[PDB]
Design a protein around this nucleic acid. Sequence first.
RNA 1: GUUUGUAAUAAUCUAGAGAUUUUAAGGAACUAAGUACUAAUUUUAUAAAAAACUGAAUGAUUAAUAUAUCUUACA
Length: 109
Amino acid sequence: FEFKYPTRELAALCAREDFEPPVARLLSETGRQSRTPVFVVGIYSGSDKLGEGAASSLDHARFKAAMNALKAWYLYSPGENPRVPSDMLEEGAKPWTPAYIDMGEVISR
RNA sequence: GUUUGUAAUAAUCUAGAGAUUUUAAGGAACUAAGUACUAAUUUUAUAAAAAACUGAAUGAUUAAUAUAUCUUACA
Ligand SMILES: [Mg+2]
Ligand SMILES: [Mg+2]
């Protein structure tokens, strides 16, 4: 994954799914006014925590938190060893259950 | 200035080694001041690499974008 303006893609995702607008919140911090600080930022849509990222800058920590929120959306997995439609060709197989079909990747500014 | 000490020549005196006068003379490693007389004097000698990170405050300038499609315009 290589993101470009991940903060806009996450705002567009929440808008598409009708989630509350994403708000970045400082969960923890230490070393502000130092050479290697640690800002732990978490992006919430209402009261639910979507993603979190820890970086040495406030902006970077906010971008890293949005990227991790988008990865969690794209890297959703129903299971590690899921059934494949090719399994029905092998006779003697259980009935096929409809799989999850996504709408498509978010297109943002 | 300080220091050393009264040069030579000349005049006079002297058995003659010398004396007197011109003579506070003539010198001088030194000190101070003044003076550009001498030397600081040959056509871009050498070295020196040169503005970090995060937060905060406060400015300037700017596409600081994405998706679909393969034709579009001119002649
Ligand atoms: Mg004297
Ligand atoms: Mg700096």
